[PDB]
């Protein structure tokens, strides 16, 4: 069995996007597709279930009106329409399937798609402001979208350096790095590459 999901998606708040999950292998049986949501700062969240052969569905109350599950037997494909998008809809969405000729009391989450990443934002491309920190550091504040790249003294300073993941502050991304003296920040989306050195106070 294989589950092929639709490509990554970027949307503005209030918009709507449609995800798809095509099943392959042993689709002559009627099988369930379970949709799952995982935000970067959260675990798994069950959205709902759909049988593509019989059309039946089970839903999570929280997602009724937010997600709509549909399917078509012959193409062995399930769809999930996401309406009225918000920042809390930014997540990776997985489709899953049970085992072939498995029991109802066997594990339901046997086969997994590769996931569809949905990002909801109103933010325009923004270059990062870069600030010195004084071990010393480098604060990369207020860019969009990801990624940025950071090195120390053109990459000649690597040992003793900690570069932390990005976080979302005020709808833009903020990042930081530290060292046990200059940092080199690159934000390709803004076609930017800034350098800043730590003069002591």
């Amino acid at each position: 069995v294989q589950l092929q999901q639709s490509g990554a998606e970027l949307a503005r708040p209030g918009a709507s996007v449609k995800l798809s999950c095509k099943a392959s292998g042993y689709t002559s049986t009627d099988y369930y597709i379970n949709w799952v949501k995982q935000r970067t700062g959260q675990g798994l969240e069950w959205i709902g279930e759909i049988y593509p052969g019989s059309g039946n569905t089970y839903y999570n109350e929280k997602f009724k009106g937010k997600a709509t599950l549909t399917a078509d037997k012959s193409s062995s494909t399930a769809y999930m329409q996401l309406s009225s998008l918000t920042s809390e809809d930014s997540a990776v969405y997985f489709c899953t399937r049970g085992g072939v000729y498995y029991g109802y009391d066997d594990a339901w989450f046997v086969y997994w798609g590769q996931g569809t990443l949905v990002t909801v934002s109103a933010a325009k491309t923004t270059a990062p402001s870069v600030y010195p920190l004084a071990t010393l550091g480098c604060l990369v504040k207020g860019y969009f979208p990801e990624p940025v790249t950071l090195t120390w003294n053109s990459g000649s300073l690597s040992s003793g350096v900690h570069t932390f993941p990005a976080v979302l502050q005020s709808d833009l991304y903020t990042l930081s790095s530290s060292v046990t003296i200059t940092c080199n920040v690159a934000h390709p989306a803004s076609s930017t590459k800034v350098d800043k050195k730590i003069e002591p106070r």
Partner: protein, 209 residues
């Protein structure tokens, strides 16, 4: 709906036996909840471990076993291996819908415990010239990779303007995280002291300006 509760994190050593639990907010976990377990390894590698409380899925090692223990469902790993370091999600069926637990991060120990090394940076001059002030709390070299962060202003607990990253692995297989407290320039000048406190393995490491 109902709420399903798991341990946030658990620790085991190679060869030990560890039990993960999965509780229901509605009452005892019944066989009619048909408890499932899912293992998440890095890079979104998911494996369905358990169905129907205790039916281990084809291909899953025998050291994994599900069961009911008291009023809750449980997953027992008898003879834990290194590859069993993962996040374990349980899920319960309530007649017409499914609910995931919050997940349990299972660390299989491979190095001694290490307390967080903490550094706290003030806002730069150049940031204050935008009338903004960001306080950067860097947290490094802690193991296991599970921490709580709390900030203070002049001793009082802060409740707004905090962003913290998920703990991420270092090259030495220890962990690192960062926390940011975002203020206005005036608000930072109002107060005498600011502090970042990291909680790890039942102990707090704190730094103050």
């Amino acid at each position: 709906q109902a709420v399903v509760t798991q341990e946030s994190a658990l620790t085991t050593s190679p060869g030990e036996t560890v039990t993960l639990t999965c509780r229901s907010s509605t009452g005892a976990v019944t066989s009619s909840n048909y408890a499932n377990w899912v293992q998440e390894k890095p890079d979104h590698l998911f494996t369905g471990l358990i169905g129907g409380t205790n039916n281990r899925a084809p291909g899953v090692p025998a050291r994994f076993s599900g069961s009911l223990i008291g009023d809750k469902a449980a997953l027992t790993i008898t003879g834990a291996q290194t590859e069993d370091e993962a996040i374990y999600f349980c899920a319960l069926w309530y007649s017409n819908h499914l609910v995931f637990g919050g997940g349990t991060k299972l660390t299989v120990l491979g190095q001694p415990k290490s307390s967080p090394s903490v550094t706290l940076f003030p806002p730069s001059s150049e940031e204050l010239e935008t009338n903004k002030a960001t306080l950067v709390c860097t947290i490094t070299d802690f193991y296991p990779g599970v921490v709580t962060v709390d900030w203070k202003v002049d001793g009082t607990p802060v409740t707004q303007g905090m962003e913290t990253t998920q703990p991420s692995k270092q090259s030495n297989n220890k962990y690192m995280a960062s926390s940011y407290l975002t203020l206005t320039a005036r608000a930072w000048e109002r107060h005498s002291s600011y502090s970042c406190q990291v909680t790890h393995e039942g102990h707090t490491v704190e730094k103050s300006l």
